[PDB]
Design a protein around this ligand. Structure first.
Ligand SMILES: [Cl-]
Ligand SMILES: [Cl-]
Ligand SMILES: [Kr]
Ligand SMILES: [Kr]
Ligand SMILES: [Kr]
Ligand SMILES: [Kr]
Length: 162
């Protein structure tokens, strides 16, 4: 397992525009297109992202391409963030995947706001971090995914994904 396989599991693969858990237009492997309630807008953002008139539908390769860019951007985002990078660098490889997943889902900003958990993660206080992480809107709105990511961060193993 790895970050790609992990997120593919959490986000799934959809080839037609869909609405995510918060109702926003998304496509592929969790590629958010827009927070706007307009399908046309979503459609315009999609054509912009792919470089052609997609008519709301994409191929699997095109979906994987956006996923790649997205994974990439997520990491880079972490590395450029002064609050995140130090935590991330202190982590082992499995745990880092958990951090990437969260950022991919909720953005750099969101995650950077988990002050208390970031510190416990940095201090290697696994159980504590896991309890603090679950005290969030995140966990309450998508609990099953949240449990997978939290277990990953808590244990450093892929057991929640096997
Ligand atoms: Cl894009
Ligand atoms: Cl969930
Ligand atoms: Kr992080
Ligand atoms: Kr994490
Ligand atoms: Kr975090
Ligand atoms: Kr954790």
């Amino acid at each position: 397992m790895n970050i790609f396989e992990m997120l593919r599991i959490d986000e799934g693969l959809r080839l037609k525009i869909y609405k995510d858990t918060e109702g926003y237009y998304t496509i592929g492997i969790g590629h958010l297109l827009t927070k706007s309630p307009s399908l046309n807008a979503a459609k315009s953002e999609l054509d912009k992202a792919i470089g052609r008139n997609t008519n709301g539908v994409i191929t699997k390769d095109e979906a994987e391409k956006l996923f790649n860019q997205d994974v990439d951007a997520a990491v880079r985002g972490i590395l450029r963030n002064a609050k995140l990078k130090p935590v991330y660098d202190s982590l082992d490889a499995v745990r880092r995947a958990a951090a990437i997943n969260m950022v991919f889902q909720m953005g750099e900003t969101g995650v950077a706001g988990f002050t208390n958990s970031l510190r416990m993660l940095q201090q290697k206080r696994w159980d504590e971090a896991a309890v603090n992480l679950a005290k969030s809107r995140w966990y309450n709105q998508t609990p099953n995914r949240a449990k997978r990511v939290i277990t990953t961060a808590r244990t450093g193993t892929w057991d929640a994904y096997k």
